[PDB]
Write a protein that binds this ligand. Structure first.
Ligand SMILES: CC(=O)N[C@@H]1[C@@H](O)[C@H](O[C@@H]2O[C@H](CO)[C@@H](O)[C@H](O)[C@H]2NC(C)=O)[C@@H](CO)O[C@H]1O
Ligand SMILES: CC(=O)N[C@@H]1[C@@H](O)[C@H](O[C@@H]2O[C@H](CO)[C@@H](O)[C@H](O)[C@H]2NC(C)=O)[C@@H](CO)O[C@H]1O
Ligand SMILES: CC(=O)N[C@@H]1[C@@H](O)[C@H](O[C@@H]2O[C@H](CO)[C@@H](O)[C@H](O)[C@H]2NC(C)=O)[C@@H](CO)O[C@H]1O
Ligand SMILES: CC(=O)N[C@@H]1[C@@H](O)[C@H](O[C@@H]2O[C@H](CO)[C@@H](O)[C@H](O)[C@H]2NC(C)=O)[C@@H](CO)O[C@H]1O
Ligand SMILES: CC(=O)N[C@@H]1[C@@H](O)[C@H](O[C@@H]2O[C@H](CO)[C@@H](O)[C@H](O)[C@H]2NC(C)=O)[C@@H](CO)O[C@H]1O
Ligand SMILES: CC(=O)N[C@@H]1[C@@H](O)[C@H](O[C@@H]2O[C@H](CO)[C@@H](O)[C@H](O)[C@H]2NC(C)=O)[C@@H](CO)O[C@H]1O
Ligand SMILES: [Zn+2]
Ligand SMILES: [Zn+2]
Ligand SMILES: [Zn+2]
Ligand SMILES: [Zn+2]
Ligand SMILES: [Zn+2]
Ligand SMILES: [Zn+2]
Lengths: 267, 269, 271, 269, 266, 266
């Protein structure tokens, strides 16, 4: 019912606490397996590398999905995109090990050329339906001034895949060959400007930064002079709001708030 | 009139632009509207979004036509219902919901749920209807609604605005003209499902009919589901209500046509 | 980048100020310092003059080369049932050539994608990069694709495509045939967003306003007297909005940020 | 109509299928046709392809409507003519060519020369017209013409056949119905520009008018060009002529609608 | 590695010795086949007789239906959504009459079947799961075939067969269990250039009854024209096979579907 | 001279006098040609012999490779990214053996070559720069060609040739220096309807060695079947040219690629 209620603030608090059982305090309660979905090789480590270490240690299985092949990411006129792909595959495998990640799916869409297509949704759902994960981390597609199409696409496609994985009529051949529908229990947005849940990474920062530099191709010493200070400044932004030094921010909301929720911004 | 060049305050020029130049009436914005389109992504989006307001407009004697972008093919967790069945069902569910609110005509584009293109082709389909029904008003979902993760919603919002904007251009889908349909300018644009509403409608009296017209969509709202949705729908009506100083309201964003293009102060309404 | 350790910082506000001033050398005060050549990228014929026509005059006068890229052909922009889109294109080409001269713009590239039908495709990125790589410009102006309530697809597309083209122009693996036929990669030094609701850098145009408005009306097809009764007051009201924030009468606003902030920068909004 | 199962020769069943079951009339195939569409990829394709036949049909009192798929934007080597100019020009050139042959109405889709999609959207546009003009006949270029390297031609051929086939299905572009246009079945399909024609038309009397109506397209045929095209166009008319036992003829391939689907003996006509 | 100097010699040696191409008994070691149909009814109309004979000889036959049949009615009262639901049941009944147990439905909309990468990926996924020995698909080179769903299905089928064995193609299929697969046999049905026939004179009455199972597609109005047609087709194929009623197929070695200028000579 | 009443007369006069079509020595004034190949190896397999002979007679030959060869291995250990890198080196070595110095790589992915406007624009850009006299491309009408990248390359090549001289097509090409260009000669390789041949009996062993340069595509397993095939192809072409081993091409006037119902008669 809820007919008896006359205040919005009352109905809001009752909707989150009683109806949805939304737990912002310990939101990872029953999570044994998560997917981290990264646009490019290095996006998971840069975005939430610290948190992935902490989850790996607490004994939680972490699987990467890498949307693109990193083909474009060099100014060096001597490295063909084909070489760079081969390289950045090895660089992610090394970064992965340092953080405790064992499995990585490679979609192999070309860097800069990631469709916001039905086909890519179907690919992501196939994996979600197989690995039956409890949680999914994906980049916030509403991050202001994000000018990289592969990031915007990955964010939207991830949410669509999460939302449609439980619908048996969606990519129905997945069912006809064994894969049953699946509902993810937890959705975390990384790389967000409106985080509502933080993770202290002050202890783990040095490992995070070493696991980033594992991506040698992306971070020679030239480049690293600018990126190290940046990455620290990011951790401090998140830290300020979490009252620690170095933190990683995430936006966590109930699945319901990703649809026709005009008060979604109030968490 | 007197010279606009003479103005030195923005606040002055702004108030003069809205009141004198545009004649923008936030007070009674539906003044001369005899016919409106409500554009819904899925079967149930009109009734959930602005079902109350549709009843009130139907009663005040205003013709209300639905355009449904998709067929609802995907919207069941029941492994026994093919998308083809569910479409057939949700067509009947919208026809029943429609009658309860006083809506007589519904156009079905029949784009598949989850597979609504943001294509030129879909704009052409919407314009064709607008040009035929010559409506005074169009309601459509705010495509800028924060955290809206459903592509069919984002698409419908953008496509609707594009269709409104391009319906009056004779060079757009010119075959429409060559077969009878003359260009048309809509007089009124309302965004429903918005987090930035500037105009409200008391629905406290009509809430029980609205909720009954939602449950008409049996396939979407068994009792399991309805335990969570009823409280939600009420919480939404209260959010809108708070800002309108009533209990249960429906919010809309209404702006002048001009503000949907290169208007850096559009947010200030 | 002096004596001090970046690890030793415990305040965000400190690290932020040090990132912008020392690491990035971000100059919001005089951001155009060493710019001899800019591209202005416009969705339709008239978008450059309406958006930043004043600023283009001032840059032309200070001796800076300004090149237009026009994404579309303006084919759709008339209610007159007698003008075919093919006529209107031909017309608006001449109207932009006249507007261009009044502002000191000599070169204009026409992509000739049809008005209302501008793809957000790879192909269009390749076209923009080709030009950037040829003209090796120091600066690019493009419309803010995050402008609230912008309902025109050609505007949203142009904004995104422009940023992508800027970002990918320096990657030799992107449209590699461009290289194989002479065009070397290029890094733009400056990015300005026009038509933005979050400007951080202004330009007094109070002196230039009357020329700007005359250069807009050069687009006769788009601004008969009927229409102009509503647009003149609007355009002035816009200049005042920007003016208020710049403490002058009539200004043009731009959003200028470091290249890095267009990617995974959660504090990008704080500028 | 008497006892099909007891046939044991193919040749018998074939002759009975064409004569009795389909009533296929290769002799006088235009019997009851009062209105036809000629579908041309570019401005000039109808006059070059079947200009003579169009004159003869116009004279015998039959209404002939052009559909032009593209705008001709690309068709000049002159570095001074923008595609926008050339479109405007070739529109006037087709209007003058049209009058010389007795054609009053022309639909312009305005897809750009070289950029004609083989999309669903273009089928929907063609069906809209077919459903309005309710024509008895449609002429379109044979998409199986060997070594045809122009995509706009291949596309137009396929799209035309699809539009003919789908015009009578009420579930196809259903909004067409919801706004007045009822389904329509075309009675006659003619392929022009074909290497396997089965029906000819003497144009020996009309040739000089045809050639004058081609040159109406000044932009496409200066004197330089015309030195090579006039002899070509005559050589084509002779190829068709040889098979029709006249001097100058126009060839068409006419088959029953059914043979455009899963007909392994389609080639035997 | 012979320096042979006649083409006719090298040709006969290529087919018989190098490729072991058996036009005589080409189904030798086939325990499982896919029949790929554009629309519900295309398998039964095309090769319904042959499917019965393969079912009886104990061979597993699986249907893949590309489209939903949404468009296939002139009746202004039947929504495409109804017609889909109906034609699903009609194919299930037709299927049983011929001994077909499993049917995959891609549910691409009738008239709207993309020739996209995405559709290739869908077909490969199935091929890689069912590991079939054989695939039947409609000849995309059939002259005057004006139905896009048919042309598309033909091309997509061949592409799927060709790419199913490449581990780099739709690599996620592998990462979740499905290993690459090489089909051993490719049959084109609905072809004007058949090189292998099947007597269906005994089975014809069942075939025709299994077609009429598709009530929506064949009321009595329509059936007056289709029955004679379907018989005339069987006779065309029959004439070349020296029986009354036959079904024709084009069977070639995998290799001949690529850069083979003498492919036509079989 | 309108007053002709035989077709055969007008036809012979059209080819000889009006068009000056020279099937006898069609390469007369050609100093530079493009060979357009779908995959790395398609030029050497298709017309490798002819490329050697043109290189020797002092004619510049440039390759355009549409795809990256990413898919072309059954080996589950080679990522497509590795295979691309490899086949680049394999084509560079094959190229040198035949006298080819320059190669353009479009880097569209194997199996994923769009028949898009964008790809036409890419090909025209090159044609307009290199101003070649001749272009060789695979016959898109080759019967039973089931590889989409081949069909696409054929069509795209013809479109690029046809549109390179139109200043309104990809107009930015002009605005940055590249003037329009008309190719003088079009040769279709990999065709079943050739009208012009080239003896390669002398060059065969080099051709075959230049093919095997593509190690990734031709281990010894594979080569057992391909060597006999490649010889059988050369013999097919040879038979019609009255030599042992030949390469066939279809050469027609530019005009015959449009609305020419007698195009087949050459
Ligand atoms: C798009 C833009 O202007 N921002 C730049 C980023 O694109 C860029 O990120 C890197 O871009 C490459 C090009 O596509 C990618 O291959 C690479 O994966 C990606 N790296 C990350 C961090 O995801 C960064 C750093 O090069 O600079 C921005 O300015
Ligand atoms: C996108 C997301 O994660 N949010 C969920 C919504 O997608 C979902 O909305 C319903 O989605 C179906 C799938 O396409 C539609 O058929 C149906 O019309 C739609 N309902 C509405 C209100 O339009 C809702 C309901 O399950 O839950 C969200 O969390
Ligand atoms: C309502 C909406 O979505 N936007 C309208 C605009 O379309 C329109 O702007 C003009 O649109 C034409 C059609 O695409 C363009 O050709 C024309 O250049 C464009 N003008 C500018 C400034 O770029 C305006 C003006 O009528 O109204 C908007 O509301
Ligand atoms: C495909 C090819 O290379 N053949 C040429 C034709 O494509 C070409 O056709 C002409 O193409 C122009 C640009 O697409 C069109 O504007 C023009 O209408 C069209 N001609 C006709 C009569 O349809 C012809 C003519 O230049 O030459 C062929 O060689
Ligand atoms: C293009 C044309 O004129 N040929 C017609 C066929 O397209 C048509 O095929 C039928 O099309 C329906 C709509 O796409 C399908 O639902 C239906 O399954 C299909 N029939 C078969 C046997 O597959 C046929 C039959 O109406 O008539 C041709 O003339
Ligand atoms: C389509 C089909 O069934 N025929 C096969 C050909 O497709 C195949 O060609 C090869 O395909 C690979 C995958 O795309 C390519 O990487 C490779 O370049 C290509 N070979 C050539 C000659 O270019 C051939 C050989 O693998 O076998 C046919 O059976
Ligand atoms: Zn990234
Ligand atoms: Zn919805
Ligand atoms: Zn504009
Ligand atoms: Zn043409
Ligand atoms: Zn069919
Ligand atoms: Zn190849």
């Amino acid at each position: 019912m809820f007919e008896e209620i006359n205040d919005f603030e009352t109905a809001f608090k009752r909707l989150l606490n009683e109806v949805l059982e939304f737990d912002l305090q310990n939101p990872l309660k029953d999570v044994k397996k998560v997917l981290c979905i990264e646009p490019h090789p290095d996006d998971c480590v840069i975005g939430m590398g610290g948190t992935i270490k902490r989850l790996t240690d607490r004994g939680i299985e972490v699987i990467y999905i890498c949307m693109t092949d990193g083909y474009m990411g060099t100014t060096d006129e001597n490295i063909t995109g084909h070489e760079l792909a081969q390289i950045r595959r090895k660089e992610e495998e090394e970064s992965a090990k340092m953080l405790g990640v064992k499995k990585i799916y490679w979609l192999n869409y070309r860097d800069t050329e990631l469709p916001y297509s039905r086909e890519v949704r179907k690919d992501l759902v196939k994996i979600i339906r197989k690995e039956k994960p409890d949680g999914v981390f994906l980049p916030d597609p509403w991050l202001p001034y994000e000018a990289h199409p592969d990031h915007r696409a990955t964010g939207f496609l991830a949410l669509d895949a999460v939302a449609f994985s439980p619908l048996p009529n969606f990519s129905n051949i997945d069912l006809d060959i064994g894969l049953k529908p699946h509902s993810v229990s937890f959705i975390g947005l990384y790389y967000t400007s409106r985080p509502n849940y933080f993770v202290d990474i002050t202890d783990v920062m040095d490992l995070k930064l070493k696991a980033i530099r594992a991506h040698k191709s992306q971070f020679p010493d030239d480049i690293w002079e600018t990126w190290e200070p940046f990455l620290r400044t990011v951790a401090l932004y998140y830290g300020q709001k979490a009252g620690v030094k170095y933190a990683e921010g995430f936006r966590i909301m109930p699945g319901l708030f990703y649809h026709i929720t005009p008060f979604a911004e109030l968490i």
